[PDB]
Amino acid sequence: PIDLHDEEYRDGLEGTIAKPPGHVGWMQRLLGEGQVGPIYVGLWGVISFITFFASAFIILVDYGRQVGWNPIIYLREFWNLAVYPPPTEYGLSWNVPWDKGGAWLAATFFLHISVLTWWARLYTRAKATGVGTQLAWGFASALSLYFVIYLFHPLALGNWSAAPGHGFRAILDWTNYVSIHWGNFYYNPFHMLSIFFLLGSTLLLAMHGATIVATSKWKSEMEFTEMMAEGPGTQRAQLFWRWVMGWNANSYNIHIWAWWFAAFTAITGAIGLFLSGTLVPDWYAWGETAKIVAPWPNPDWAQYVF
Amino acid sequence: RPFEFRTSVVVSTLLGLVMALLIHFVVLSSGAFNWLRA
Amino acid sequence: RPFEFRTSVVVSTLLGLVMALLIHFVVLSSGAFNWLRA
Amino acid sequence: RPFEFRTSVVVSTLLGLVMALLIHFVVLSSGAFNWLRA
Amino acid sequence: RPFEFRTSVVVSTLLGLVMALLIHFVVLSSGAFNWLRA
Amino acid sequence: RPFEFRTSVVVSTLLGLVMALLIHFVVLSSGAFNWLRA
Amino acid sequence: RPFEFRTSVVVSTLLGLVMALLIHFVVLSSGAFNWLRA
Amino acid sequence: RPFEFRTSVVVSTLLGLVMALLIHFVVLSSGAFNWLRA
Amino acid sequence: RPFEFRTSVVVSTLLGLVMALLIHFVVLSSGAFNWLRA
Amino acid sequence: RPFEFRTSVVVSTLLGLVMALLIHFVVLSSGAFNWLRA
Amino acid sequence: MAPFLMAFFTIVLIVATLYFLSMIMS
Amino acid sequence: NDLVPDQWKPLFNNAQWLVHDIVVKTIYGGLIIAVIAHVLCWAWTPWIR
Amino acid sequence: NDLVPDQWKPLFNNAQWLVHDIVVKTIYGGLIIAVIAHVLCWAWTPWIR
Amino acid sequence: NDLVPDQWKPLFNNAQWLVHDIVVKTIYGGLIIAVIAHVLCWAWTPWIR
Amino acid sequence: NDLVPDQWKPLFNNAQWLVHDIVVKTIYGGLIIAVIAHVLCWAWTPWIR
Amino acid sequence: NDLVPDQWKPLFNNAQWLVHDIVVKTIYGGLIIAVIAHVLCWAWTPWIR
Amino acid sequence: NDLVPDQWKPLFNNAQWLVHDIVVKTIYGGLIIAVIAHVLCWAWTPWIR
Amino acid sequence: PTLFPEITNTVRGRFYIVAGIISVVMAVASIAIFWWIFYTITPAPAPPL
Amino acid sequence: RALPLPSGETLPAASAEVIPFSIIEEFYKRPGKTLAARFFGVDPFDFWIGRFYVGLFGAISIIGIILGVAFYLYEGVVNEGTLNILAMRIEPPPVSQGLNVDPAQPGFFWFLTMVAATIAFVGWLLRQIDISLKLDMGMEVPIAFGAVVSSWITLQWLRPIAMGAWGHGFPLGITHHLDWVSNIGYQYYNFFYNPFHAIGITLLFASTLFLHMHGSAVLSEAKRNISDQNIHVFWRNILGYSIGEIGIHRVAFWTGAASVLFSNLCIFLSGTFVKDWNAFWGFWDKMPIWNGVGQGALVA
Amino acid sequence: MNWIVATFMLMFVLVAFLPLVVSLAYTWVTNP
Amino acid sequence: SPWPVWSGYALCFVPLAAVILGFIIAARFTDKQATSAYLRLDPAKAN
Ligand code: BCL
Ligand code: BCL
Ligand code: BCL
Ligand code: BCL
Ligand code: BCL
Ligand code: BCL
Ligand code: BCL
Ligand code: BCL
Ligand code: BCL
Ligand SMILES: CC(C)=CCC/C(C)=C/C=C/C(C)=C/C=C/C(C)=C/C=C/C=C(C)/C=C/C=C(C)/C=C/C1=C(C)C(=O)CCC1(C)C
Ligand SMILES: [Fe+3]
């Protein structure tokens, strides 16, 4: 009841554009596929595109205003310009001048709308083809972390100044300032949990890629066919991981592991960041009372001085 | 039927347990009752 | 049958053990009873 | 049969060993008995 | 048979060796016996 | 037969060598015998 | 025959070379013989 | 015959080369000869 | 043929352009010729 | 196709170019020849 | 005697490598 | 499942009835012990005040 | 499973009954020793006070 | 498994009985040595006090 | 396996008995050497005090 | 394997006996040299004191 | 393999005997050169003292 | 008299050894010459007042 | 008849023999193709202990693990009296000591623990190479593990020797190597501004995103009637490009290696050549394209 | 010396980079 | 005095033990499923 040909070559809204596919050439030789193909545009993806364009236009024009409209200073200082949120005075209020955080709020709102509509587009397109909707829920977890960073942490703290500043250099500064302002961010347990899950995700990705490429002579990369009858490549991979560490998985469970590692990373990061400001004002001072900080009576300080 | 009995039972029990923990924690952290050393 | 017997036993036993350990530790760290050197 | 005998044996043995180690460590670290140099 | 003999022997020997090492280290680090330069 | 002769020999030799090395290093670093410059 | 002659020769030679190296480095790093500039 | 002549020759040559390089590096790094600018 | 003509042409042209730009910039930044306002 | 002639031309040319550039930069930054404004 | 010993060792190395290379490639 | 009473035949197997019985007795004993312990703890040091 | 009693036949094999019996005796001995140790420790130094 | 007694036939093989006997003797000797060592250590320096 | 005694035939091959004998003699020699070394070390410097 | 003794026939081939003899002689020579070197080192500087 | 002596016939082929002779001669020459080098090095700067 | 006829008799294999020797020599010479030039033309340390 | 599929599903009603796992293991288990079998002519340990393969590099690795664990627990229980793993403090020797070690002085057991850990890691890598050779596979897993092992080697061997004090090594303590990381990151202020650290962070984030997307893609087509082209049509409607079955695994492998490689390069460069990453970017505003184009607070 | 050893460690650090370039080259070349 | 506060107990150790036990259970169940018998291509003739 689902035709794959009409899903790729319809016209107009609820259809595709760039319909005659292009070929890149070098991507075929290195990755195995080089067709760019048509792209879907119907309903969802129009609202998101328009809103993201509006937000980017606002940010770029406010960048232009900060240098006197000089295009050479623009190129010189493009990587360190930023539109900052309103200062700590009357922080949550929207009655701020356009150059003191007025341009930040509108761009943030449009970005919010863009990301929500993109999630909707993902959900509908996943449903329209017959595949499952796992990607939508993964993006939901990522959006949970994003919305904790941009909406729910500033609120419940009382000021918009707790959010990042819309710039290439302004996010690193935000991370450093947030780490400094709440004691020591290393001693936040949910930060440790998120680091655990992130490193596990990278390790699992590397292992899975290496294994599937090593056993690629017997066509182990066709995961959909391996989930019905297991050929020699999957058996060799299973035996390899059985003889090395004493236990192994199959061609189905490892993807569950990867999915849940990523989801746990996002969720624990969001929870830790939310608790950082509202419940525990000082993470080092809490770790000293929780007996997780090691005593350091007489440090050898000649290592840290030039 | 719109909803299975098992799903309703699971959702209700999880919501109840989460709420019980949340209100005990919130009542404890307020320090307005003098329970467990004030 | 909405729920297996085994799953009920497992969930209940795990919840009880965790709650017992948590309550014992929370009472011990309060210093409100004079148990184990005050 | 809801549960294997071996599963029950393994779970009970591991829980008992862990609890014994934990209780010995907690009693030692409290400094309330004068055991192993006070 | 619920438990093979080999696993029983292996687990018992490993636990015994681990406990012996841990007990010797804990007693040596207590400094309550005057052993190996007090 | 539960255990091969070769496995027993290998495990015993490895354990003995590890214990000998550990004991020599621990006695050397304690500074309680005056051996190899005190 | 439980063990090949080649395996025994290889294991013995490797162990001997490794231990001779270890003893030489440990004696050199102890600084108790006045060898190679004290 | 237990050992091929080729294997013995290759192993002995590689061991000799590695040992010569290691001995040269260790004698240089000791700073006790005043060779190659002290 | 060990090397294509196209590769030789591309490599030579790229190296020449890069070297010309580098030499002009190094001579300009040295301040030794009084060119473009000293 | 044989790789020895080709892999050699590329490596030799790259080494020569890199060493020449590095050596001119080292001599220029030393300031011991009075070249390009002292 | 730093230069003299280096010269002696280098000469020994060169003569030995010449001898062995002549033995192999003949 | 001939040992299971008439009411609980659709839910219980013959072997699970005995394990359920053991669990019920264990829970009742634990409840009695907990009540006694709570009474002694309150008599020793009230926690509400 | 002929050595298993009539009641516990649906749950126990013939080789698991002996292991269960061994475990039961071990647990009973451990409980006796633990009671003795607790009484000795209390007589030495009360921990509640 | 003809050397195994009638009671433990469903649990033990014939070649495992000897290893079990050796393990039992080793455990008993280790317990005796440990008891002697503990008595000597107590006679040297009591650890409870 | 005609050299293995009657008791240990189900456990030992004929070629492993000799290696086992060699290991046993080596262990006993090592034990006597260890006893002598410990006696000499104690006579030099007691470690318990 | 006719040159191997009667006792060690099941363990040794005819070509490994000679290599074993060579290894034994090398080990004995190394032991003698090690004893001489240890005596000289002790005469130079005692390491126990 | 008729050039090989009677004693070492089971171990050596005809073509490996010559290479073994070459290796032995090279080892002896290397030993002589190493001895002279060590003597000269000690004559320059003693490393024991 | 060789054990590597495929490396010591073939023209292609015979050029492996010489190529490797020349490559190692040239690498060592390059490193030595560059660092000698750097350490010979570099200025003296900037002293204090 | 019901055939249990590998995914765990059972379907009513090809070489689909429902066979146990023992036969697969017995067919592929053959001896004599490891690395040491080529060098010495025989692998001294060519047997299986349970499920694990014990080669010539398994014994060295196990010795290293045992010695490392013993030396770690000795320093932290003894010589520190902590008795808890979260507050012990296993430090190297002081910077004043130099590159030489001394059993009498403190910091000796840190040296032994580090050496044993290095030996164990190298043995693990070689044993993986052996097992990969026994199965007629590629060498990609050893490449990735070698990348991470080189990351380990850079921090504890190369950097301390380049600096020349041997006290430039992070302590082996839980919640205390974080202390070393925090103090090193702030000594060379704005470790964010290190160009190679940013590349490592970018590749880490890309690795997590790629892994989660691949998991979602595979799990979404698990147990449905699909023509094997539905996932490509989904990935072409969204994002306007599909990479293929073999392309994704290569990307994952390459990115996972590259992130750690760039991170090790950044840490080494921060150690020796640069002292302040803020002064590194002082050349940007001075290139001869923007020098005289501004006025007031806007000129640099 | 101060600089020679540092350059040698830099060489060692880049030798780590090399193996993955080898895999990239193999993947590029072996396709045709 | 020597005891950690209740926050230190729960927020730090409940998640820790949960992670360890969940990992050890997930590994057991995944190994069980991977070692179970199901449709495989015959290794004697497939390769
Ligand atoms: C946790 C939720 C539980 C659940 C808990 C209950 C409870 C509890 C009851 C029922 C009852 C019913 N449930 Mg049920 N039930 C669940 C799952 C299900 C499912 C399913 C999963 O498919 C179904 C089909 C049903 C169906 C039904 C009906 C058969 C039955 C009568 C409903 C009725 O007439 O409501 C029509 C009536 C109403 C909607 C009344 C609403 C009143 C509102 C909420 C105002 C209340 C005021 C308050 C009491 C006053 C407060 C004073 C304070 C002091 C301030 N339940 C889940 C598992 N169900 C009832 C029953 O059996 O009664 C005999 C009943 O009491
Ligand atoms: C702040 C002042 C008071 C206080 C004020 C109150 C008040 C007021 C109330 C409580 C309530 C309760 N408090 Mg309180 N509380 C205090 C101190 C304590 C202390 C303590 C350590 O001192 C403890 C242990 C408790 C504990 C309790 C519970 C007995 C009870 C909440 C139960 C619950 O979780 O419901 C939520 C639980 C669930 C939703 C599920 C529970 C488990 C179920 C029954 C098991 C089913 C198992 C089966 C297998 C599941 C099948 C489905 C599965 C999905 C497979 N309180 C102090 C002294 N407390 C409440 C109460 O009385 O409730 C009756 C209440 O209203
Ligand atoms: C603090 C004041 C006292 C003190 C007070 C007490 C009190 C009070 C008690 C103890 C108890 C014990 N103490 Mg204490 N104890 C003190 C100091 C010590 C010191 C020491 C170094 O100073 C030591 C070593 C011990 C040692 C011990 C044990 C003998 C015993 C706990 C056993 C156990 O682990 O049970 C837990 C172990 C298990 C559940 C499993 C054990 C292993 C099984 C038997 C092995 C089977 C192997 C087979 C292969 C398994 C099959 C299944 C497998 C999964 C395959 N005590 C001080 C002096 N001690 C307890 C006791 O007497 O127990 C009887 C007790 O109640
Ligand atoms: C100096 C006094 C020190 C001390 C220093 C040491 C040192 C140092 C060592 C021991 C070792 C041991 N110590 Mg002590 N020990 C002390 C106090 C004690 C106390 C005590 C309660 O006071 C006890 C119970 C022990 C008990 C023990 C044993 C566990 C062990 C010796 C017996 C053994 O296993 O022999 C069985 C041993 C063997 C059978 C080995 C046989 C080896 C054969 C002879 C070959 C040797 C190698 C050979 C020369 C190599 C070259 C030839 C080629 C192989 C061909 N020690 C004090 C604190 N102890 C030794 C040990 O073995 O630890 C594992 C050891 O290394
Ligand atoms: C980027 C460089 C260009 C290129 C640039 C040139 C130039 C320029 C010349 C040639 C010439 C030749 N090139 Mg062409 N050539 C290219 C690519 C190729 C390719 C190919 C890709 O397949 C091939 C096969 C060739 C092959 C050839 C020959 C057909 C021809 C004569 C060579 C000869 O006899 O040299 C033998 C002679 C030499 C090698 C001379 C070496 C001289 C050395 C370097 C000393 C120079 C002294 C210096 C000038 C003195 C300076 C005084 C100052 C005051 C200090 N070229 C590349 C792409 N080629 C020559 C030609 O056709 O002449 C009619 C010629 O002039
Ligand atoms: C002013 C004195 C300065 C100095 C300033 C410069 C500058 C500035 C440059 C050089 C360049 C060079 N210098 Mg000088 N140089 C100095 C001292 C030296 C010394 C010395 C030991 O003293 C040496 C050995 C050199 C040597 C060299 C050569 C490497 C090179 C010139 C030859 C060449 O390759 O031509 C081969 C070059 C060509 C064949 C180029 C041909 C280009 C054609 C004509 C097209 C040009 C572009 C075209 C106009 C674009 C528009 C049209 C469209 C194409 C349609 N210089 C001093 C310090 N030198 C030049 C160079 O080429 O660097 C890479 C350069 O740019
Ligand atoms: C100023 C005095 C300085 C010094 C400064 C330099 C500088 C500067 C350089 C050298 C270089 C070298 N030095 Mg010097 N050098 C010094 C002292 C020494 C001493 C010593 C013991 O005193 C020694 C042994 C050396 C040895 C060496 C050699 C390794 C090398 C030159 C030979 C060579 O390889 O030519 C082989 C070289 C070639 C075959 C190149 C041929 C190139 C052809 C002709 C093309 C050139 C480019 C061309 C013009 C481009 C334009 C045209 C297009 C191609 C079409 N130097 C002192 C300290 N030395 C030079 C070198 O080659 O570095 C790599 C170099 O650049
Ligand atoms: C690395 C070790 C070498 C090796 C080295 C030796 C050496 C060395 C000897 C033998 C000897 C024997 N070896 Mg062999 N042998 C090896 C491999 C093998 C293999 C095999 C791999 O299959 C086999 C089957 C054998 C078998 C045998 C027998 C044929 C033979 C006599 C054993 C005996 O009676 O012991 C029974 C005797 C004992 C167990 C003696 C135990 C002594 C204990 C350890 C005490 C020693 C104290 C010490 C000497 C003095 C201390 C003095 C200090 C100054 C304080 N070897 C490996 C490759 N073998 C012996 C032989 O041929 O003699 C003629 C012999 O001397
Ligand atoms: C300087 C005084 C130092 C000291 C420094 C050293 C050093 C340094 C070493 C030893 C070694 C050993 N020490 Mg000591 N040792 C000291 C005190 C002791 C004490 C003690 C309680 O006081 C004891 C028990 C020991 C015991 C031992 C033995 C384990 C061993 C020597 C015997 C052996 O097995 O030879 C068996 C060895 C052989 C049979 C080797 C035979 C080698 C043949 C001859 C070939 C050699 C290489 C050859 C020249 C290469 C070139 C030619 C080509 C092959 C063709 N030492 C003091 C503290 N000792 C040595 C050893 O071998 O350790 C493993 C060693 O390297
Ligand atoms: C300030 C704070 C912290 C406030 C917190 C407020 C809250 C929310 C409190 C929450 C309280 C709760 C939720 C308590 C939970 C109590 C429970 C669930 C106990 C379970 C007992 C389970 C029991 C007894 C199970 C026993 C199992 C048994 C006997 C097993 C039996 C057996 C089985 C089943 C077998 O096959 C074979 C083995 C065997 C025969 C022994
Ligand atoms: Fe996959």
- SS3 state of residue S99: coil
Q: Tokens 């959900």 — which residue? A: A123
Nearest to A62 by CA among A113, A93, A92, A105: A105
CA proximity to A12, closest of A51, A49, A38 = A38
Closest CA to F5 of S58, G13, O14, N17: O14
Q: Cβ–Cβ of N8/M15 closer than 8 Å? A: no
Report the SS3 class of residue A22: coil
What values do phi and psi take at A132, rounded to 5?
-75, 175
The burial class, CB within 10 Å (0-12 / 13-18 / 19+), for B3 is exposed
From D1, D9, D32, residue closest to M47, measured CB to CB: D32
C-alpha D21 to ligand 3 mean position (Å)? 8
Cα separation, F29 vs F37, whole angstroms: 12
Nearest CA to ligand 4 atom 41: O30
Closest CA to A206 of S259, S137, T21, U20: S259
Q: What angle do CA A25, A31, A36 make, to 5 degrees?
A: 55
N7, closest residue in chain M (CA to CA) = M18
User: Could you give the CA distance from residue S135 to residue S131 in angstroms, rounded to a whole number?
Assistant: 7
Print the SS3 string covering S33-76.
Answer: CCHHHHHCCCCCCCEEECCEEECHHHHHHHHHHHHHHHHHHHHH
Torsion A198-A199-A204-A205 (CA) sign? positive
Query: Which residues in N lie closer than 8 A to residue F12 (C-beta atoms)?
Result: none
At CA P28, angle to CA P26 and CA P29, rounded to 5?
65
Pairing of strands S18-19, S10-12: unpaired
Residue Q19 in marked binding region: no
Ligand nearest to the CA of I19: 6
* Number of neighbours of residue A161 by Cβ within 10 angstroms: 18
Q: List all chains that touch chain E, counting a touch as 3 or more CB pairs closer than 8 Å.
A: D, F, M, N, O, S
Task: Specify whether the CB–CB gap between F23 and E21 falls below 8 A.
Answer: no
Contact between residue A216 and residue S138 where contact means Cβ atoms under 8 Å apart: yes
The type of residue at A120 is: A
State the binding site of G for bacteriochlorophyll a.
24, 35
Q: Which residues of C are annotated as a binding site?
A: 24, 35
Contacts of range C10-16, beta carbons closer than 8 Å, 24 or more positions apart: none
Q: How was this structure determined?
A: cryo-EM
Q: What is the CB-side half-sphere exposure of residue Q3 using CA atoms within 13 A? A: 10
Query: Using CA atoms, how far apart are residues O1 and O18, in angstroms rounded to an integer?
Result: 11
Flag if A229 and U41 touch (Cβ within 8 Å): yes
Backbone φ and ψ for S3, nearest 5 degrees, come out as -100, 110
Q: Which of L10, L23, L47 sits opposite C32 (nearest CB)?
A: L47
Q: Which residues of O touch G (CB under 8 A)?
A: 13, 15-16, 19
Question: Which residue type does R43 have?
Answer: P
* Cα gap S233→A3, rounded to integer Å: 11
Q: E strands of B1-38, at which residues?
A: none
Choose which residue among Q23, Q25, Q26, Q27 to substitute to test ligand 9 binding: the one with the highest number of ligand atoms within 8 A of its C-beta: Q27
Contacts of F9 in chain O (CB under 8 A): 19, 23
Per-residue HEC secondary structure of U6-39 comes to: HHHHHHHHHHHHHHHHHHHHHHHHHHHHHHCCEE
Given the DSSP bridges, would you call strands S52-54 and S10-12 parallel, antiparallel or unpaired?
unpaired
Give the residue from S192, S235, S240, S237 showing the smallest Cα distance to S210.
S235
Farthest-apart Cα atoms in chain P, separation: 54
CA dihedral E9, E10, E15, E16 (to 10 degrees): 60
**Cα-only R_g, chain P:** 18
Smallest Cα distance from L44 to chain M, Å: 10
- Quick one: which ligand is closest to I16's CA? 6
| Ligand 6 lined by I20 (C-beta under 6 Å) | yes
Q: Which residues of D touch C37 (CB under 8 A)?
A: 30-32
List, in sequence order, every residue forming a beta bridge with M20; answer none if it has no partner: none
Check: CB of residue Q14 under 8 Å from CB of residue Q2: yes
Test mutation, M9, M14, M47, chain D, max D CBs within 10 A: M47
Q: DSSP string of chain T?
A: -HHHHHHHHHHHHHHHHHHHHHHHHHHHHH--
Q: Let me know: does A268 contact A193? Beta carbons within 8 Å.
A: yes
Q: Is N38 exposed, middle or buried (0-12, 13-18, 19+ CB in 10 A)?
A: exposed
Q: Was J24 annotated as part of a binding site?
A: yes
The structure was resolved to a resolution in Å of: 3.1
Residues of chain F found within 8 Å of residue S62, distances taken between Cβ atoms: 14
Taking the C-alpha atoms of residue F13 and residue F15, their distance in angstroms, rounded to an integer, is 5
Distance of CA B12 to the CA centre of its chain: 11
Distance (angstroms) between ligand 5 centre and the Cα of I8 equals 12
- Tokens matching residue G24: 């030489």
Neighbours of chain U (3+ CB pairs under 8 A): A, C, D, S
CA dihedral (A49, A55, A58, A61) positive or negative: negative
Nearest residue by C-alpha to atom 35 in ligand 9: P31
What is the maximum span of chain R, computed from C-alpha positions, in angstroms?
71
- Asked if A98 contacts A61 with a C-beta cutoff of 8 angstroms, the reply is no
- Whether residue A273 contacts residue S28, with contact meaning beta carbons closer than 8 Å, is answered with no
- Residue S52 token pair: 């694990």
Helix pair S195-220, A253-278: axis angle to 10 deg: 130
Distance of CA S77 to the CA centre of its chain: 29
CB contact under 8 A, Q47 and H1: no
Chain S residues lying within 8 Å of I25, measured CB to CB? 288
Residue S232, SS3 per DSSP: helix
Task: Return the structure tokens found at I10.
Answer: 């591309």
| CA–CA gap between residue J27 and residue R38 (Å, rounded) | 8
**In which element (H, E) is residue A39 found?**
strand A39-40
CA dihedral A55, A58, A62, A68 (to 10 degrees): 140
Rounded CA separation A37/A16 (Å): 10
